[PDB]
Design a binder for this molecule. Structure first.
Ligand SMILES: Nc1nc2c(ncn2[C@@H]2O[C@H](COP(=O)(O)OP(=O)(O)O)[C@@H](O)[C@H]2O)c(=O)[nH]1
Ligand SMILES: Nc1nc2c(ncn2[C@@H]2O[C@H](COP(=O)(O)OP(=O)(O)O)[C@@H](O)[C@H]2O)c(=O)[nH]1
Ligand code: ALF
Ligand code: ALF
Ligand SMILES: [Mg+2]
Ligand SMILES: [Mg+2]
Ligand SMILES: [N+]
Ligand SMILES: [N+]
Lengths: 168, 161
């Protein structure tokens, strides 16, 4: 059961690290090498009983080999079918918070009704204030997938935003 | 719930192809490049009502690529914890059917008593008679993960076993 949250963004942003933080398990390989993840990885999790599918994808860039090209094509296929996208941003590589200043082509390609949460990762390095805010109507979260600081704010956000109804 | 079936073997054996055949979707990326799969891939399926976790792994070898090396260590970790291993052999690379001939080091490393099914893949290229047999007490299945021929025999085997 549960809605689909897709984690997407540039290589090395910390997407698999976030998947692992959310799954509470080393589900995905994490290294400092861009293009570590190629296959789509999915974890089914629960937050206070609410089921949720978390989907980790290949970092989006010009592909360095055929496998990574296919992983990126599949990433877009998952984004297109997502219920929400977590746009993961390496906070050390940009100071911009509005995703139109970060990567407008990414934002523009997203399906019309698809909600996006901007996740500024690596707050442990940048020293940004942890937690939730808003920018141009998008949820904005600052956290560290590596240390786990601020990931509870994301969990609460997913709890509050990814709900659905059901019966027998 | 459901038992854990781990598909394991050399690179390019057709492990991800078999995952995709069993899962009925393009769950894993398939190419002719050794070391395509590195992360462990898991698909929960039901076969005629029976729940199974089918687990696809990095082809086993001494890899140079750091990520493939990690995937191979993780493949061994899955094998260690499996309820059955499907040992996939590329039928085009050997006529041998006994896994002791094919790759004794692999068979010897498996947990004591972990059941192993030898799967001779690429029967569409070799012309081998599809279906189930046995070798030295091991189940042996000849099939083509690409065309799907003989995969029904594997499905029935998993249900039975
Ligand atoms: N300092 C710090 N490093 C991080 C954080 N999140 C990820 N990393 C590192 O960034 C690199 C890439 O992480 P990974 O999860 O593989 O990125 P992906 O390619 O987007 O999946 C790895 O060296 C991670 O350990 C973080 O919050 N803080
Ligand atoms: N002709 C034929 N090719 C196959 C079959 N199964 C896999 N292949 C090919 O073998 C290559 C490796 O397949 P793949 O599933 O990625 O191998 P893996 O590394 O073991 O996962 C690919 O080019 C596949 O299309 C088969 O049954 N018949
Ligand atoms: F660069 Al990656 F998963 F390794 F997006
Ligand atoms: F060589 Al592979 F999955 F690509 F075992
Ligand atoms: Mg990754
Ligand atoms: Mg594979
Ligand atoms: N990475
Ligand atoms: N492959």
């Amino acid at each position: 059961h549960g809605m689909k949250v897709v984690i997407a963004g540039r290589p090395n942003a910390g997407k698999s690290s976030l998947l692992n933080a959310l799954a509470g398990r080393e589900a995905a390989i994490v290294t400092d090498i861009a293009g570590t993840t190629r296959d789509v990885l999915r974890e089914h999790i629960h937050i206070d009983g609410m089921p949720l599918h978390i989907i980790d994808t290949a970092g989006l860039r010009e592909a360095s080999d055929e496998v990574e090209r296919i992983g990126i094509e599949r990433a877009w296929q998952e984004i297109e079918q997502a219920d929400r996208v977590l746009f993961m941003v390496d906070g050390t590589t940009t100071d911009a918070v509005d995703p139109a200043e970060i990567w407008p082509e990414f934002i523009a390609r997203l399906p019309a009704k698809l909600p996006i949460t901007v996740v500024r990762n690596k707050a442990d390095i940048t020293g940004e204030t942890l937690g939730m805010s808003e920018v141009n109507g998008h949820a904005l979260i600052r956290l560290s997938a590596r240390t786990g600081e601020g990931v509870d704010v994301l969990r609460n956000h997913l709890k509050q935003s990814m709900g659905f109804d059901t019966n027998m």
